[PDB]
Amino acid sequence: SYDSPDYTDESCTFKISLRNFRSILSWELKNHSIVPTHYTLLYTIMSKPEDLKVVKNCANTTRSFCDLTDEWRSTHEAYVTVLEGFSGNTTLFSCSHNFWLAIDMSFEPPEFEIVGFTNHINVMVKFPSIVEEELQFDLSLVIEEQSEGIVKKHKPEIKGNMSGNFTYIIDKLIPNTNYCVSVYLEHSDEQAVIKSPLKCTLLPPGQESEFS
Incomplete structure (x- = not known):
């Protein structure tokens, strides 16, 4: 039924939580054709978007949700983030989003x-x-x-x-x-x-x- 084999592809949605007032941002990038495993959570602050960091514990990681308790101490800021996920060995994608902690705090x-x-x-x-x-x-x-x-x-x-x-x-x-x-x-x-x-x-x- 219907005519559309591709309905969804990489939700590229980063979910940020707050455990014991500790920040932990995650992502939602699904795979259709290529099979990605490791990713690289890159993050910065709106006022300083030029200061993005590929968190060592969140770079080419074969995991999804990365943590950050003292990595996003700029609660008053909007932690802009760019999660670049590499499919296997190559960067398959790069998605960003302005995290409004001071306003979102989950x-x-x-x-x-x-x-x-x-x-x-x-x-x-x-x-x-x-x-x-x-x-x-x-x-x-x-x-x-x-x-x-x-x-x-x-x-x-x-x-x-x-x-x-x-x-x-x-x-x-x-x-x-x-x-x-x-x-x-x-x-x-x-x-x-x-x-x-x-x-x-x-x-x-x-x-x-x-x-x-």
């Missing part, structure tokens, strides 16, 4: 769960142990609350809160409230919603039970 790896009290909520976001007094990202945390059909977004002061087991409490709720608590970061923007797989933790559902 968090998810961190640990997080939530305990719900019959009437309140206990949200603990497990961010790495870091002393804000020397942090690299001013990034905030957005505690989203999806209780009993009600969705919401919180944003507690991360001034020294992103250093371990974040302690937040979602209260002011009626008994029996199963909420899906997400953990996404923000920064004066409603487009950087890295809403990770929430936690739908319910609380001891009152339901009266002949108490009054």
Whole structure:
């Protein structure tokens, strides 16, 4: 059916994550005809596009996602990147993209769960142990609350809160409230919603039970 043998060819899509406020950029270049294996993740900063680096640990590598915790310390900048993938022994392609960290910051790896009290909520976001007094990202945390059909977004002061087991409490709720608590970061923007797989933790559902 249809007339088109070639539908897709090299998504050349670089996915950047953020584990414990550590940067890790990856790529999505599929192969149709030629069979590539090793690649070379090259990266730079928008303000200095002339300073691209073929990361030694991400050059002719027969891997995909390359990491960068202290390699992209220019969070405030847009880490422009050029991932040149070599098919076998030759450079088969070269794709670039302006990574907006300061504006994108994709968090998810961190640990997080939530305990719900019959009437309140206990949200603990497990961010790495870091002393804000020397942090690299001013990034905030957005505690989203999806209780009993009600969705919401919180944003507690991360001034020294992103250093371990974040302690937040979602209260002011009626008994029996199963909420899906997400953990996404923000920064004066409603487009950087890295809403990770929430936690739908319910609380001891009152339901009266002949108490009054």
